[PDB]
Amino acid sequence: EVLEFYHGYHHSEDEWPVAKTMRDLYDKFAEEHSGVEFKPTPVNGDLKDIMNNKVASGEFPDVIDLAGNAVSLAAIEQKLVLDLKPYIDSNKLEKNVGLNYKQNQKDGKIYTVHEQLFTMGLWYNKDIFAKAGAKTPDQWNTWDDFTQAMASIRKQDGVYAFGAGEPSIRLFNTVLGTTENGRKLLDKPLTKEGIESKEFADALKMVMKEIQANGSKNAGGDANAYSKDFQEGKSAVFFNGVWASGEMSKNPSLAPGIYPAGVAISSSGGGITISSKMSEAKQKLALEFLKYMTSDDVQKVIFEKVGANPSNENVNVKELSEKSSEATTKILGQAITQVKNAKAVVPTVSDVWGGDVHTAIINALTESAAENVDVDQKVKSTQDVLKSL
Ligand SMILES: CC(=O)N[C@H]1[C@@H](O[C@H]2[C@@H](O)[C@@H](CO)O[C@@H](O)[C@@H]2O[C@@H]2O[C@@H](C)[C@@H](O)[C@@H](O)[C@@H]2O)O[C@H](CO)[C@H](O)[C@@H]1O
């Protein structure tokens, strides 16, 4: 028997050393293991496609690491996915899964566990801000402070303010969390009245206006294609998580911050997700793999080698940052501490409202960058699109 494990760590160690570290973690589990063999399969392209193509025709990949992506809602309805909570309970792994335990709980059931937490503030270039005379992220008490800082930076040439596209939903996600009503919207699945909802409409409009001011030229991509520009000093701010630290530590000009009014993103994300339709032996090896990726020793590697925030609460991130000589581990701990000490913390749209709502909002924010789009009627048509899904 073969247990197929799909992940997105396909990168050569020369393009992203983290991928190689992860792959070393996986086939070390394979060598550790009986009558069922573990087979890691690195996916080049969309991980959601592997899942969704199997969900159609009523199946599921044996094991998939969704890497922050949300579980298919159709997969849960058809119970293509195993409930992980009994095994966690049961093997005393509440602390090992950390934030996943409460946040990935859907009616007392856990369908996915992310070994790396979706801990997300933002990144900014200290030199570009200083030169523009722009308020740094710690000075952004309101949305208007952020937009005024962005306007100042655009008065300089050679640099654009920020990358828009996928990163622009992080602005929507956090600006919604600026009021109590917006925060409770992100506590439940999305409803028609929630879409409509002055807070939902205002957030949409604020961000779209800023994305349009940011320029249509600067909305053609995802976070991965904006990272290079930021490392090279071509942009002022970069909306990505703490896990960016390894790529970020190379340029000492760039620093962690969080979003206006002291808001940060703190969610689990989708992670290790396992099929319901397997023999007893490969189901228990798959749960053994969850146990492994979530163990004390692996999570130390998750923090120290992989520059990410571990799900395991037994790993002392601060003390490890304390005793490290690594620049990566230093700003990693700094970035995590900022999110942990945010005035308000929100989950990702993807986690709470699902992958479809995530994608629809990203598309609408991207489309709004076009110079000929009226923001008011775009907001209205965006909320028209959300109600239908
Ligand atoms: C769902 C989502 O918004 N994912 C974005 C995000 O993903 C990264 C985080 O989930 C991080 C947590 O520490 O783990 C990273 O592995 C993950 O990166 C992505 O997934 C892995 C498996 C690889 O395929 C990576 O190349 C891929 O980026 O952040 C990235 C940018 O850092 C993207 O915006 C993702 O869309």
Side-chain angles (χ1 to χ4, degrees), residues 7-11 16 22 43 47 65-70 114 116-118 166 170 222-224 240-244 308-309 350 358:
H7 66 270
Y9 299 103
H10 56 83
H11 313 253
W16 199 35
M22 294 296 199
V43 173
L47 279 170
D65 174 28
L66 287 174
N69 292 117
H114 202 192
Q116 292 164 241
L117 262 23
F118 218 91
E166 178 191 41
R170 322 299 191 191
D222 291 359
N224 282 330
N240 204 11
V242 299
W243 55 86
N309 189 28
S350 193
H358 175 80

PDB file of all heavy atoms in Angstrom, residues 7-11 16 22 43 47 65-70 114 116-118 166 170 222-224 240-244 308-309 350 358, ligand 1:
ATOM      1  N   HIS A   7       2.203  18.099  -1.478  1.00  0.00           N
ATOM      2  CA  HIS A   7       2.663  19.370  -0.897  1.00  0.00           C
ATOM      3  C   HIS A   7       3.169  20.323  -1.989  1.00  0.00           C
ATOM      4  O   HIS A   7       3.395  19.903  -3.123  1.00  0.00           O
ATOM      5  CB  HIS A   7       3.754  19.120   0.145  1.00  0.00           C
ATOM      6  CG  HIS A   7       5.021  18.563  -0.426  1.00  0.00           C
ATOM      7  ND1 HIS A   7       5.248  17.210  -0.558  1.00  0.00           N
ATOM      8  CD2 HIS A   7       6.129  19.179  -0.903  1.00  0.00           C
ATOM      9  CE1 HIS A   7       6.441  17.015  -1.092  1.00  0.00           C
ATOM     10  NE2 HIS A   7       6.997  18.194  -1.310  1.00  0.00           N
ATOM     11  N   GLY A   8       3.346  21.598  -1.646  1.00  0.00           N
ATOM     12  CA  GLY A   8       3.808  22.598  -2.609  1.00  0.00           C
ATOM     13  C   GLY A   8       5.268  23.014  -2.486  1.00  0.00           C
ATOM     14  O   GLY A   8       5.672  24.047  -3.020  1.00  0.00           O
ATOM     15  N   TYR A   9       6.067  22.210  -1.793  1.00  0.00           N
ATOM     16  CA  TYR A   9       7.493  22.489  -1.647  1.00  0.00           C
ATOM     17  C   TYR A   9       8.289  21.795  -2.755  1.00  0.00           C
ATOM     18  O   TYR A   9       8.927  20.764  -2.541  1.00  0.00           O
ATOM     19  CB  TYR A   9       7.982  22.097  -0.249  1.00  0.00           C
ATOM     20  CG  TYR A   9       7.298  22.856   0.871  1.00  0.00           C
ATOM     21  CD1 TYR A   9       6.297  22.258   1.631  1.00  0.00           C
ATOM     22  CD2 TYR A   9       7.648  24.176   1.165  1.00  0.00           C
ATOM     23  CE1 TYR A   9       5.660  22.952   2.663  1.00  0.00           C
ATOM     24  CE2 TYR A   9       7.014  24.879   2.190  1.00  0.00           C
ATOM     25  CZ  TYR A   9       6.023  24.261   2.936  1.00  0.00           C
ATOM     26  OH  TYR A   9       5.395  24.960   3.949  1.00  0.00           O
ATOM     27  N   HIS A  10       8.227  22.390  -3.947  1.00  0.00           N
ATOM     28  CA  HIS A  10       8.824  21.844  -5.173  1.00  0.00           C
ATOM     29  C   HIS A  10      10.148  22.522  -5.517  1.00  0.00           C
ATOM     30  O   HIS A  10      10.890  22.056  -6.377  1.00  0.00           O
ATOM     31  CB  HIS A  10       7.852  22.037  -6.339  1.00  0.00           C
ATOM     32  CG  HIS A  10       7.446  23.464  -6.552  1.00  0.00           C
ATOM     33  ND1 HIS A  10       8.218  24.360  -7.261  1.00  0.00           N
ATOM     34  CD2 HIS A  10       6.351  24.150  -6.147  1.00  0.00           C
ATOM     35  CE1 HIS A  10       7.616  25.536  -7.284  1.00  0.00           C
ATOM     36  NE2 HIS A  10       6.481  25.436  -6.617  1.00  0.00           N
ATOM     37  N   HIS A  11      10.420  23.628  -4.832  1.00  0.00           N
ATOM     38  CA  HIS A  11      11.518  24.532  -5.154  1.00  0.00           C
ATOM     39  C   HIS A  11      12.890  23.883  -5.022  1.00  0.00           C
ATOM     40  O   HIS A  11      13.144  23.125  -4.080  1.00  0.00           O
ATOM     41  CB  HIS A  11      11.455  25.772  -4.248  1.00  0.00           C
ATOM     42  CG  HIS A  11      10.086  26.372  -4.141  1.00  0.00           C
ATOM     43  ND1 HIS A  11       9.743  27.561  -4.749  1.00  0.00           N
ATOM     44  CD2 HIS A  11       8.970  25.937  -3.509  1.00  0.00           C
ATOM     45  CE1 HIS A  11       8.478  27.835  -4.490  1.00  0.00           C
ATOM     46  NE2 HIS A  11       7.985  26.865  -3.742  1.00  0.00           N
ATOM     47  N   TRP A  16      14.524  28.387  -3.273  1.00  0.00           N
ATOM     48  CA  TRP A  16      13.947  28.458  -1.925  1.00  0.00           C
ATOM     49  C   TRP A  16      14.423  27.279  -1.063  1.00  0.00           C
ATOM     50  O   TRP A  16      13.852  26.188  -1.137  1.00  0.00           O
ATOM     51  CB  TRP A  16      12.409  28.513  -1.980  1.00  0.00           C
ATOM     52  CG  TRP A  16      11.752  29.041  -0.725  1.00  0.00           C
ATOM     53  CD1 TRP A  16      12.231  30.015   0.107  1.00  0.00           C
ATOM     54  CD2 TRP A  16      10.481  28.647  -0.186  1.00  0.00           C
ATOM     55  NE1 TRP A  16      11.347  30.242   1.135  1.00  0.00           N
ATOM     56  CE2 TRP A  16      10.263  29.417   0.980  1.00  0.00           C
ATOM     57  CE3 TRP A  16       9.511  27.712  -0.568  1.00  0.00           C
ATOM     58  CZ2 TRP A  16       9.113  29.280   1.770  1.00  0.00           C
ATOM     59  CZ3 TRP A  16       8.364  27.576   0.217  1.00  0.00           C
ATOM     60  CH2 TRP A  16       8.178  28.360   1.373  1.00  0.00           C
ATOM     61  N   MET A  22      11.873  21.098   4.091  1.00  0.00           N
ATOM     62  CA  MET A  22      10.575  20.438   4.228  1.00  0.00           C
ATOM     63  C   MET A  22      10.579  19.035   3.630  1.00  0.00           C
ATOM     64  O   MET A  22      10.098  18.097   4.259  1.00  0.00           O
ATOM     65  CB  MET A  22       9.468  21.268   3.575  1.00  0.00           C
ATOM     66  CG  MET A  22       9.194  22.598   4.233  1.00  0.00           C
ATOM     67  SD  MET A  22       8.535  22.452   6.057  1.00  0.00           S
ATOM     68  CE  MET A  22       7.804  24.227   6.165  1.00  0.00           C
ATOM     69  N   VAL A  43       4.132  19.306  -5.641  1.00  0.00           N
ATOM     70  CA  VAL A  43       3.241  19.819  -6.675  1.00  0.00           C
ATOM     71  C   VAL A  43       3.713  21.175  -7.192  1.00  0.00           C
ATOM     72  O   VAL A  43       3.840  22.135  -6.428  1.00  0.00           O
ATOM     73  CB  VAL A  43       1.774  19.917  -6.170  1.00  0.00           C
ATOM     74  CG1 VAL A  43       0.892  20.605  -7.201  1.00  0.00           C
ATOM     75  CG2 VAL A  43       1.230  18.531  -5.826  1.00  0.00           C
ATOM     76  N   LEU A  47      -2.196  23.783  -5.614  1.00  0.00           N
ATOM     77  CA  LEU A  47      -2.522  22.687  -4.702  1.00  0.00           C
ATOM     78  C   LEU A  47      -4.023  22.470  -4.590  1.00  0.00           C
ATOM     79  O   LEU A  47      -4.474  21.349  -4.340  1.00  0.00           O
ATOM     80  CB  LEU A  47      -1.949  22.947  -3.304  1.00  0.00           C
ATOM     81  CG  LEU A  47      -0.476  22.628  -3.037  1.00  0.00           C
ATOM     82  CD1 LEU A  47      -0.066  23.190  -1.680  1.00  0.00           C
ATOM     83  CD2 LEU A  47      -0.208  21.129  -3.107  1.00  0.00           C
ATOM     84  N   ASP A  65      -1.090  18.689   2.126  1.00  0.00           N
ATOM     85  CA  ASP A  65      -0.769  19.895   2.879  1.00  0.00           C
ATOM     86  C   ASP A  65      -1.234  21.092   2.064  1.00  0.00           C
ATOM     87  O   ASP A  65      -0.647  21.434   1.035  1.00  0.00           O
ATOM     88  CB  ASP A  65       0.733  19.992   3.202  1.00  0.00           C
ATOM     89  CG  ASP A  65       1.110  21.320   3.871  1.00  0.00           C
ATOM     90  OD1 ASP A  65       0.262  21.930   4.566  1.00  0.00           O
ATOM     91  OD2 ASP A  65       2.265  21.764   3.687  1.00  0.00           O
ATOM     92  N   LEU A  66      -2.301  21.718   2.544  1.00  0.00           N
ATOM     93  CA  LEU A  66      -2.968  22.793   1.832  1.00  0.00           C
ATOM     94  C   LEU A  66      -2.219  24.120   1.902  1.00  0.00           C
ATOM     95  O   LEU A  66      -2.523  25.037   1.141  1.00  0.00           O
ATOM     96  CB  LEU A  66      -4.405  22.942   2.338  1.00  0.00           C
ATOM     97  CG  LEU A  66      -5.361  21.834   1.888  1.00  0.00           C
ATOM     98  CD1 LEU A  66      -6.705  21.997   2.560  1.00  0.00           C
ATOM     99  CD2 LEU A  66      -5.512  21.843   0.361  1.00  0.00           C
ATOM    100  N   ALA A  67      -1.249  24.211   2.811  1.00  0.00           N
ATOM    101  CA  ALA A  67      -0.326  25.353   2.897  1.00  0.00           C
ATOM    102  C   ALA A  67      -1.015  26.711   3.070  1.00  0.00           C
ATOM    103  O   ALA A  67      -0.613  27.701   2.452  1.00  0.00           O
ATOM    104  CB  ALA A  67       0.612  25.375   1.691  1.00  0.00           C
ATOM    105  N   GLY A  68      -2.044  26.741   3.913  1.00  0.00           N
ATOM    106  CA  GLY A  68      -2.819  27.954   4.168  1.00  0.00           C
ATOM    107  C   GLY A  68      -4.164  27.979   3.457  1.00  0.00           C
ATOM    108  O   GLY A  68      -5.078  28.690   3.882  1.00  0.00           O
ATOM    109  N   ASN A  69      -4.275  27.215   2.367  1.00  0.00           N
ATOM    110  CA  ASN A  69      -5.512  27.134   1.592  1.00  0.00           C
ATOM    111  C   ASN A  69      -6.627  26.465   2.379  1.00  0.00           C
ATOM    112  O   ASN A  69      -6.372  25.570   3.176  1.00  0.00           O
ATOM    113  CB  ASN A  69      -5.288  26.393   0.270  1.00  0.00           C
ATOM    114  CG  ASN A  69      -4.397  27.160  -0.691  1.00  0.00           C
ATOM    115  OD1 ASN A  69      -3.305  26.705  -1.040  1.00  0.00           O
ATOM    116  ND2 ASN A  69      -4.860  28.327  -1.125  1.00  0.00           N
ATOM    117  N   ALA A  70      -7.861  26.909   2.155  1.00  0.00           N
ATOM    118  CA  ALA A  70      -9.015  26.368   2.869  1.00  0.00           C
ATOM    119  C   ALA A  70      -9.448  25.025   2.296  1.00  0.00           C
ATOM    120  O   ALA A  70      -9.303  24.776   1.093  1.00  0.00           O
ATOM    121  CB  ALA A  70     -10.174  27.357   2.842  1.00  0.00           C
ATOM    122  N   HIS A 114      -2.643  22.958  10.194  1.00  0.00           N
ATOM    123  CA  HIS A 114      -1.499  23.622   9.586  1.00  0.00           C
ATOM    124  C   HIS A 114      -0.335  23.637  10.580  1.00  0.00           C
ATOM    125  O   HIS A 114      -0.429  24.251  11.647  1.00  0.00           O
ATOM    126  CB  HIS A 114      -1.905  25.041   9.166  1.00  0.00           C
ATOM    127  CG  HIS A 114      -1.045  25.646   8.098  1.00  0.00           C
ATOM    128  ND1 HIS A 114      -1.108  26.985   7.769  1.00  0.00           N
ATOM    129  CD2 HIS A 114      -0.099  25.107   7.292  1.00  0.00           C
ATOM    130  CE1 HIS A 114      -0.245  27.241   6.801  1.00  0.00           C
ATOM    131  NE2 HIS A 114       0.383  26.120   6.496  1.00  0.00           N
ATOM    132  N   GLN A 116       2.415  25.143  10.254  1.00  0.00           N
ATOM    133  CA  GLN A 116       2.911  26.511  10.298  1.00  0.00           C
ATOM    134  C   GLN A 116       1.714  27.436  10.412  1.00  0.00           C
ATOM    135  O   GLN A 116       0.806  27.373   9.589  1.00  0.00           O
ATOM    136  CB  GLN A 116       3.648  26.845   9.012  1.00  0.00           C
ATOM    137  CG  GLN A 116       4.936  26.105   8.795  1.00  0.00           C
ATOM    138  CD  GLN A 116       5.399  26.182   7.359  1.00  0.00           C
ATOM    139  OE1 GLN A 116       5.527  25.163   6.698  1.00  0.00           O
ATOM    140  NE2 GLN A 116       5.644  27.394   6.865  1.00  0.00           N
ATOM    141  N   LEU A 117       1.715  28.296  11.423  1.00  0.00           N
ATOM    142  CA  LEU A 117       0.608  29.215  11.642  1.00  0.00           C
ATOM    143  C   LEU A 117       0.576  30.359  10.630  1.00  0.00           C
ATOM    144  O   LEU A 117       1.616  30.877  10.230  1.00  0.00           O
ATOM    145  CB  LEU A 117       0.658  29.765  13.069  1.00  0.00           C
ATOM    146  CG  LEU A 117      -0.227  29.145  14.155  1.00  0.00           C
ATOM    147  CD1 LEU A 117      -0.677  27.710  13.864  1.00  0.00           C
ATOM    148  CD2 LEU A 117       0.472  29.241  15.498  1.00  0.00           C
ATOM    149  N   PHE A 118      -0.634  30.742  10.229  1.00  0.00           N
ATOM    150  CA  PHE A 118      -0.837  31.854   9.312  1.00  0.00           C
ATOM    151  C   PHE A 118      -0.753  33.177  10.075  1.00  0.00           C
ATOM    152  O   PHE A 118      -1.713  33.954  10.135  1.00  0.00           O
ATOM    153  CB  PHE A 118      -2.172  31.718   8.571  1.00  0.00           C
ATOM    154  CG  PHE A 118      -2.109  32.155   7.135  1.00  0.00           C
ATOM    155  CD1 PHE A 118      -1.814  31.237   6.132  1.00  0.00           C
ATOM    156  CD2 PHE A 118      -2.316  33.485   6.785  1.00  0.00           C
ATOM    157  CE1 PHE A 118      -1.739  31.633   4.801  1.00  0.00           C
ATOM    158  CE2 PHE A 118      -2.244  33.885   5.457  1.00  0.00           C
ATOM    159  CZ  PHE A 118      -1.952  32.962   4.463  1.00  0.00           C
ATOM    160  N   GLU A 166      -3.521  39.448  -4.771  1.00  0.00           N
ATOM    161  CA  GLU A 166      -3.656  38.652  -3.547  1.00  0.00           C
ATOM    162  C   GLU A 166      -3.360  39.469  -2.275  1.00  0.00           C
ATOM    163  O   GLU A 166      -4.122  39.385  -1.312  1.00  0.00           O
ATOM    164  CB  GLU A 166      -2.772  37.395  -3.599  1.00  0.00           C
ATOM    165  CG  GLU A 166      -2.828  36.524  -2.332  1.00  0.00           C
ATOM    166  CD  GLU A 166      -1.763  35.433  -2.300  1.00  0.00           C
ATOM    167  OE1 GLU A 166      -0.605  35.701  -2.686  1.00  0.00           O
ATOM    168  OE2 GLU A 166      -2.083  34.301  -1.888  1.00  0.00           O
ATOM    169  N   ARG A 170      -5.499  41.360   2.247  1.00  0.00           N
ATOM    170  CA  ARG A 170      -4.940  41.529   3.588  1.00  0.00           C
ATOM    171  C   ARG A 170      -5.261  42.919   4.133  1.00  0.00           C
ATOM    172  O   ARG A 170      -5.380  43.104   5.349  1.00  0.00           O
ATOM    173  CB  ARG A 170      -3.419  41.301   3.603  1.00  0.00           C
ATOM    174  CG  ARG A 170      -2.897  40.182   2.709  1.00  0.00           C
ATOM    175  CD  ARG A 170      -3.463  38.813   3.076  1.00  0.00           C
ATOM    176  NE  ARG A 170      -2.757  37.739   2.381  1.00  0.00           N
ATOM    177  CZ  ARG A 170      -3.156  36.471   2.347  1.00  0.00           C
ATOM    178  NH1 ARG A 170      -4.267  36.099   2.972  1.00  0.00           N
ATOM    179  NH2 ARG A 170      -2.436  35.576   1.688  1.00  0.00           N
ATOM    180  N   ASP A 222       0.510  37.935  -7.574  1.00  0.00           N
ATOM    181  CA  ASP A 222       0.369  37.425  -6.206  1.00  0.00           C
ATOM    182  C   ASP A 222       1.587  37.800  -5.359  1.00  0.00           C
ATOM    183  O   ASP A 222       2.562  38.354  -5.877  1.00  0.00           O
ATOM    184  CB  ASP A 222       0.173  35.903  -6.210  1.00  0.00           C
ATOM    185  CG  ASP A 222      -1.170  35.485  -6.793  1.00  0.00           C
ATOM    186  OD1 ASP A 222      -1.957  36.377  -7.185  1.00  0.00           O
ATOM    187  OD2 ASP A 222      -1.443  34.261  -6.862  1.00  0.00           O
ATOM    188  N   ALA A 223       1.528  37.484  -4.064  1.00  0.00           N
ATOM    189  CA  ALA A 223       2.591  37.842  -3.114  1.00  0.00           C
ATOM    190  C   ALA A 223       3.975  37.332  -3.527  1.00  0.00           C
ATOM    191  O   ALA A 223       4.986  37.993  -3.279  1.00  0.00           O
ATOM    192  CB  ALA A 223       2.242  37.359  -1.707  1.00  0.00           C
ATOM    193  N   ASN A 224       4.011  36.166  -4.165  1.00  0.00           N
ATOM    194  CA  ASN A 224       5.266  35.549  -4.591  1.00  0.00           C
ATOM    195  C   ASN A 224       6.030  36.358  -5.640  1.00  0.00           C
ATOM    196  O   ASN A 224       7.262  36.338  -5.669  1.00  0.00           O
ATOM    197  CB  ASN A 224       5.023  34.116  -5.084  1.00  0.00           C
ATOM    198  CG  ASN A 224       4.832  33.121  -3.940  1.00  0.00           C
ATOM    199  OD1 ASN A 224       5.379  33.295  -2.850  1.00  0.00           O
ATOM    200  ND2 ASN A 224       4.064  32.066  -4.194  1.00  0.00           N
ATOM    201  N   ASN A 240       2.839  40.361   3.453  1.00  0.00           N
ATOM    202  CA  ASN A 240       3.059  38.920   3.578  1.00  0.00           C
ATOM    203  C   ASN A 240       3.322  38.532   5.035  1.00  0.00           C
ATOM    204  O   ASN A 240       3.605  39.394   5.868  1.00  0.00           O
ATOM    205  CB  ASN A 240       4.195  38.449   2.663  1.00  0.00           C
ATOM    206  CG  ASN A 240       4.091  36.970   2.309  1.00  0.00           C
ATOM    207  OD1 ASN A 240       3.075  36.325   2.578  1.00  0.00           O
ATOM    208  ND2 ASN A 240       5.147  36.426   1.707  1.00  0.00           N
ATOM    209  N   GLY A 241       3.211  37.237   5.332  1.00  0.00           N
ATOM    210  CA  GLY A 241       3.325  36.739   6.701  1.00  0.00           C
ATOM    211  C   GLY A 241       4.731  36.686   7.264  1.00  0.00           C
ATOM    212  O   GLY A 241       5.693  37.058   6.592  1.00  0.00           O
ATOM    213  N   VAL A 242       4.838  36.214   8.504  1.00  0.00           N
ATOM    214  CA  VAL A 242       6.117  36.136   9.216  1.00  0.00           C
ATOM    215  C   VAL A 242       7.105  35.186   8.535  1.00  0.00           C
ATOM    216  O   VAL A 242       8.320  35.359   8.640  1.00  0.00           O
ATOM    217  CB  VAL A 242       5.934  35.745  10.719  1.00  0.00           C
ATOM    218  CG1 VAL A 242       5.096  36.784  11.451  1.00  0.00           C
ATOM    219  CG2 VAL A 242       5.318  34.351  10.871  1.00  0.00           C
ATOM    220  N   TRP A 243       6.562  34.197   7.824  1.00  0.00           N
ATOM    221  CA  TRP A 243       7.342  33.185   7.118  1.00  0.00           C
ATOM    222  C   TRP A 243       8.234  33.765   6.015  1.00  0.00           C
ATOM    223  O   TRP A 243       9.106  33.072   5.494  1.00  0.00           O
ATOM    224  CB  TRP A 243       6.404  32.118   6.544  1.00  0.00           C
ATOM    225  CG  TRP A 243       5.313  32.680   5.664  1.00  0.00           C
ATOM    226  CD1 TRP A 243       5.399  32.951   4.329  1.00  0.00           C
ATOM    227  CD2 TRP A 243       3.980  33.041   6.060  1.00  0.00           C
ATOM    228  NE1 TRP A 243       4.208  33.450   3.869  1.00  0.00           N
ATOM    229  CE2 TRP A 243       3.320  33.522   4.910  1.00  0.00           C
ATOM    230  CE3 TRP A 243       3.278  33.001   7.274  1.00  0.00           C
ATOM    231  CZ2 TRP A 243       1.990  33.953   4.935  1.00  0.00           C
ATOM    232  CZ3 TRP A 243       1.958  33.432   7.296  1.00  0.00           C
ATOM    233  CH2 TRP A 243       1.330  33.902   6.136  1.00  0.00           C
ATOM    234  N   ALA A 244       8.016  35.037   5.679  1.00  0.00           N
ATOM    235  CA  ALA A 244       8.822  35.753   4.684  1.00  0.00           C
ATOM    236  C   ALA A 244      10.212  36.140   5.196  1.00  0.00           C
ATOM    237  O   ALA A 244      11.066  36.576   4.421  1.00  0.00           O
ATOM    238  CB  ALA A 244       8.080  36.992   4.200  1.00  0.00           C
ATOM    239  N   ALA A 308       9.466  29.959   9.894  1.00  0.00           N
ATOM    240  CA  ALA A 308       8.023  30.099  10.094  1.00  0.00           C
ATOM    241  C   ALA A 308       7.599  29.980  11.558  1.00  0.00           C
ATOM    242  O   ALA A 308       8.386  29.563  12.410  1.00  0.00           O
ATOM    243  CB  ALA A 308       7.282  29.090   9.238  1.00  0.00           C
ATOM    244  N   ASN A 309       6.356  30.373  11.838  1.00  0.00           N
ATOM    245  CA  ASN A 309       5.769  30.276  13.173  1.00  0.00           C
ATOM    246  C   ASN A 309       5.174  28.880  13.408  1.00  0.00           C
ATOM    247  O   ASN A 309       4.208  28.494  12.746  1.00  0.00           O
ATOM    248  CB  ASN A 309       4.710  31.367  13.381  1.00  0.00           C
ATOM    249  CG  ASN A 309       4.214  31.451  14.827  1.00  0.00           C
ATOM    250  OD1 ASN A 309       4.934  31.125  15.772  1.00  0.00           O
ATOM    251  ND2 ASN A 309       2.984  31.910  14.999  1.00  0.00           N
ATOM    252  N   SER A 350     -10.280  33.547   4.080  1.00  0.00           N
ATOM    253  CA  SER A 350     -10.223  32.172   3.591  1.00  0.00           C
ATOM    254  C   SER A 350     -10.632  31.127   4.631  1.00  0.00           C
ATOM    255  O   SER A 350     -11.357  30.189   4.313  1.00  0.00           O
ATOM    256  CB  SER A 350      -8.815  31.866   3.071  1.00  0.00           C
ATOM    257  OG  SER A 350      -8.806  30.668   2.317  1.00  0.00           O
ATOM    258  N   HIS A 358     -12.811  34.133  -0.664  1.00  0.00           N
ATOM    259  CA  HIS A 358     -11.420  34.596  -0.783  1.00  0.00           C
ATOM    260  C   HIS A 358     -11.065  35.005  -2.228  1.00  0.00           C
ATOM    261  O   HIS A 358     -10.714  36.163  -2.481  1.00  0.00           O
ATOM    262  CB  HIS A 358     -10.501  33.487  -0.248  1.00  0.00           C
ATOM    263  CG  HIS A 358      -9.036  33.746  -0.414  1.00  0.00           C
ATOM    264  ND1 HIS A 358      -8.321  34.563   0.433  1.00  0.00           N
ATOM    265  CD2 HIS A 358      -8.140  33.246  -1.298  1.00  0.00           C
ATOM    266  CE1 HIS A 358      -7.053  34.579   0.063  1.00  0.00           C
ATOM    267  NE2 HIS A 358      -6.916  33.784  -0.983  1.00  0.00           N
TER     268      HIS A 358
HETATM  269  C1  LIG B   1      -3.524  30.405   1.320  1.00  0.00           C
HETATM  270  C2  LIG B   1      -2.547  31.564   1.144  1.00  0.00           C
HETATM  271  O1  LIG B   1      -2.932  32.732   1.185  1.00  0.00           O
HETATM  272  N1  LIG B   1      -1.286  31.189   0.963  1.00  0.00           N
HETATM  273  C3  LIG B   1      -0.210  32.158   0.753  1.00  0.00           C
HETATM  274  C4  LIG B   1       0.931  31.938   1.733  1.00  0.00           C
HETATM  275  O2  LIG B   1       1.306  30.683   1.979  1.00  0.00           O
HETATM  276  C5  LIG B   1       2.396  30.328   2.799  1.00  0.00           C
HETATM  277  C6  LIG B   1       1.969  30.226   4.268  1.00  0.00           C
HETATM  278  O3  LIG B   1       0.866  29.356   4.367  1.00  0.00           O
HETATM  279  C7  LIG B   1       3.161  29.730   5.100  1.00  0.00           C
HETATM  280  C8  LIG B   1       2.868  29.593   6.596  1.00  0.00           C
HETATM  281  O4  LIG B   1       4.089  29.643   7.310  1.00  0.00           O
HETATM  282  O5  LIG B   1       3.596  28.480   4.600  1.00  0.00           O
HETATM  283  C9  LIG B   1       4.084  28.521   3.276  1.00  0.00           C
HETATM  284  O6  LIG B   1       4.437  27.202   2.926  1.00  0.00           O
HETATM  285  C10 LIG B   1       3.026  29.027   2.294  1.00  0.00           C
HETATM  286  O7  LIG B   1       3.653  29.236   1.045  1.00  0.00           O
HETATM  287  C11 LIG B   1       2.990  28.582  -0.068  1.00  0.00           C
HETATM  288  O8  LIG B   1       2.820  27.175   0.049  1.00  0.00           O
HETATM  289  C12 LIG B   1       3.992  26.376  -0.026  1.00  0.00           C
HETATM  290  C13 LIG B   1       3.592  24.911   0.111  1.00  0.00           C
HETATM  291  C14 LIG B   1       4.798  26.653  -1.300  1.00  0.00           C
HETATM  292  O9  LIG B   1       4.098  26.179  -2.435  1.00  0.00           O
HETATM  293  C15 LIG B   1       5.050  28.156  -1.421  1.00  0.00           C
HETATM  294  O10 LIG B   1       5.773  28.464  -2.594  1.00  0.00           O
HETATM  295  C16 LIG B   1       3.722  28.913  -1.371  1.00  0.00           C
HETATM  296  O11 LIG B   1       3.955  30.298  -1.439  1.00  0.00           O
HETATM  297  O12 LIG B   1       1.968  32.910   1.433  1.00  0.00           O
HETATM  298  C17 LIG B   1       2.522  32.831   0.066  1.00  0.00           C
HETATM  299  C18 LIG B   1       3.630  33.865  -0.114  1.00  0.00           C
HETATM  300  O13 LIG B   1       4.557  33.728   0.965  1.00  0.00           O
HETATM  301  C19 LIG B   1       1.413  32.992  -0.982  1.00  0.00           C
HETATM  302  O14 LIG B   1       0.891  34.326  -0.938  1.00  0.00           O
HETATM  303  C20 LIG B   1       0.305  31.982  -0.682  1.00  0.00           C
HETATM  304  O15 LIG B   1      -0.775  32.091  -1.612  1.00  0.00           O
END
